[PDB]
C-alpha cells in the first residue's frame, strides 16, 4: 500500500520507483492501486456471500440448507495462469475479512479440469484476471452451470476491459478497469514475461512479438 | 510489519488480534515468512544472476546464453499448496532482478517443452520425507535433461527425511510436526492464512468429506 512514483529515466522509459519498465508505454495501475482496490474488493465479495447459505457436504445426514463457514467454504474457481497471482492475494485479503474459502484451479486457452466434484447447490466464485472480449468467461460460466447447476456462479475480476467485448458478459465483481490496449504485469504476460511485475502496464506494440519462441 | 502472537481468553492463539482456534502455536508469522522469503530472493538472484544456459530465443547463436528475458530461468511449481508461496517468491526475484518464467505441475502436467540445456528451479511448499520431490526431480532431469536442476522450498523438515533429497534452497525449518496456513492445509481449508501454525491433532480430520 506504499504509494508508488512514476516517472520517466534519461532514456524515456517508463519508470515505477526508478525502476525501467522500457516494454510499458503508460502505467494502467501501479501496485498500491491494484491493492487498495483488491482489499475494498475483499470486503465487497466478503459482504455479498457473508450470510449466504448453500448445500451441506460437511454433514451429509444433514437436509437443510448450512450457512458459508470452514464446514462449507465458499468454492473458488481460479483460472491458470495468470489469475494464481490475483487469487493468492485476494483469499488471503477474504481471509482477514473472515470469509471462509477454498481454491481449485483450471487451465483454460481458447483443457484441464477441476478436481473439485461437489459443487452442486453450492455457492461458487470465478477468479479470473482479466476479461476482454468475454468469450473465455461466458464459455465458462455456462460450462460450470450445465455440468454442476451451482447455487450462485458469479465472475471476479481484477481487470475489465469493457471496450473489447464481442459477447454479452458482464463480471459481478470487478477490481480495475483498463484500456482497450494489451496490459502487462501482475499476472499479464508476453510468452510468460513480466508476469512478475507489482505494477500494470500498457505494452508497447513493438514488444508484442518479442519472444516468440517456444518456451 | 512485525505481528503480534498471543493468547485469547480461551487459551487460543490469536496473532494480531485474530483467533485462530485450529492452532496449536505459531511455527511463524507472516513478517518472518516474508523476511526469509526476500532474503531467499536475493539468495536465489546471486546464484543464478552470472549463470549462463542453452539460448531458445535465437536458436541462430550456437553459443550459451545469460539469463534474461530471451532466456529467464525455468521455475516449475507444483500445485496447490505452492502457488501463493510461487506468487511472492516470483515477485521478490522481480525485485532482485532475477528474469524468470513459472510453469504449474499438479502431483498428489508442464506445458513447457524447452528445457533442454535450462537452469530449472523448482519451487515447493514443503519437503519432509522427501519422496514427492525425489521422484519430481529425477522425472525431469531424464525427460527433459536441464543444464541445472534445484529446488526451493518453503518449509522444511529435515527431521522427517526418510530418503536421499537434500534441498539446495530452504526459507524456513520447522520440527516434524502437521502445519498449516499460507498454502499448507487440511482438505484445502485454512490454505489463505497469513500465518503457519502448528496444527491442533484433533483437527487433523475435522473435514473428511471429498471436495
Ligand atoms: N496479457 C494479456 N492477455 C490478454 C489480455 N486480454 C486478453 N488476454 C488473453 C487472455 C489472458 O489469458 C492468458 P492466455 O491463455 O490467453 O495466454 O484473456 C482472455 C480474456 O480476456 P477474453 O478476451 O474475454 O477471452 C490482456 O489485456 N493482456
Ligand atoms: N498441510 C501440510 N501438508 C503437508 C505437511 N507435510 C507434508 N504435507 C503434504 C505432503 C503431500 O500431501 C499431499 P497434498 O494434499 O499436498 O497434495 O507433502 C509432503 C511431501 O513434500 P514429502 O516430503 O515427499 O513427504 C504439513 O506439515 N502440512
Same mark, same amino acid.
Do not use: W
Given at each position: 500500500?506504499?504509494?508508488?512514483?512514476?516517472?520517466?529515466?534519461?532514456?524515456?522509459?517508463?519508470?515505477?520507483?526508478?525502476?525501467?519498465? @522500457?516494454?510499458?508505454?503508460?502505467?494502467?495501475?501501479?501496485?498500491?492501486?491494484?491493492?487498495?482496490?483488491?482489499?475494498?474488493?475483499?470486503?465487497?465479495?466478503?459482504?455479498?456471500?457473508?450470510?449466504?447459505?448453500?448445500?451441506?457436504?460437511?454433514?451429509?445426514?444433514?437436509?437443510?440448507?448450512? @450457512?458459508?463457514?470452514?464446514?462449507? @467454504?465458499?468454492?473458488?474457481i481460479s483460472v491458470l495462469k495468470g489469475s494464481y497471482?490475483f487469487t493468492?492475494?485476494?483469499?488471503?485479503?477474504?481471509?482477514?475479512?473472515?470469509?471462509?474459502?477454498? /481454491?481449485?484451479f483450471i487451465r483454460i486457452?481458447? %483443457?484441464?479440469? %477441476?478436481?473439485?466434484?461437489?459443487?452442486?447447490?453450492?455457492?461458487?466464485?470465478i477468479m479470473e484476471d482479466?476479461?476482454?472480449?468475454?468469450?473465455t468467461m461466458?464459455?465458462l460460466?455456462?460450462?460450470?452451470?450445465?455440468?454442476?447447476?451451482?447455487?450462485?456462479?458469479? /465472475?471476479? /475480476? %481484477? /481487470?475489465?476491459? @469493457?471496450?473489447?467485448?464481442?459477447?454479452?458478459?458482464?463480471?459481478? =465483481?470487478?477490481?480495475?478497469?483498463?484500456?482497450?490496449?494489451?496490459?502487462?504485469?501482475?499476472?499479464?504476460?508476453?510468452?510468460?514475461?513480466?508476469?512478475?511485475?507489482?505494477?500494470? =502496464?500498457?505494452?508497447?506494440?513493438?514488444?508484442?512479438?518479442?519472444?516468440?519462441?517456444?518456451?
Amino acid at each position: 500500500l506504499k504509494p508508488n512514483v512514476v516517472g520517466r529515466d534519461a532514456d524515456g522509459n517508463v519508470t515505477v520507483d526508478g525502476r525501467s519498465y @522500457p516494454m510499458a508505454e503508460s502505467v494502467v495501475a501501479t501496485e498500491s492501486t491494484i491493492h487498495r482496490s483488491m482489499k475494498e474488493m475483499a470486503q465487497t465479495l466478503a459482504n455479498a456471500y457473508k450470510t449466504l447459505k448453500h448445500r451441506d457436504t460437511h454433514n451429509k445426514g444433514n437436509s437443510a440448507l448450512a @450457512p458459508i463457514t470452514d464446514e462449507n @467454504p465458499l468454492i473458488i474457481i481460479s483460472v491458470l495462469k495468470g489469475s494464481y497471482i490475483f487469487t493468492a492475494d485476494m483469499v488471503r485479503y477474504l481471509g482477514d475479512c473472515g470469509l471462509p474459502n477454498v /481454491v481449485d484451479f483450471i487451465r483454460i486457452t481458447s %483443457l484441464d479440469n %477441476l478436481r473439485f466434484t461437489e459443487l452442486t447447490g453450492k455457492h461458487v466464485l470465478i477468479m479470473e484476471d482479466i476479461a476482454d472480449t468475454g468469450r473465455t468467461m461466458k464459455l465458462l460460466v455456462e460450462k460450470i452451470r450445465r455440468e454442476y447447476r451451482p447455487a450462485s456462479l458469479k /465472475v471476479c /475480476v %481484477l /481487470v475489465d476491459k @469493457p471496450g473489447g467485448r464481442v459477447v454479452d458478459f458482464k463480471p459481478e =465483481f470487478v477490481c480495475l478497469t483498463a484500456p482497450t490496449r494489451y496490459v502487462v504485469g501482475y499476472g499479464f504476460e508476453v510468452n510468460d514475461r513480466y508476469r512478475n511485475y507489482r505494477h500494470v =502496464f500498457v505494452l508497447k506494440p513493438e514488444y508484442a512479438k518479442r519472444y516468440p519462441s517456444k518456451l
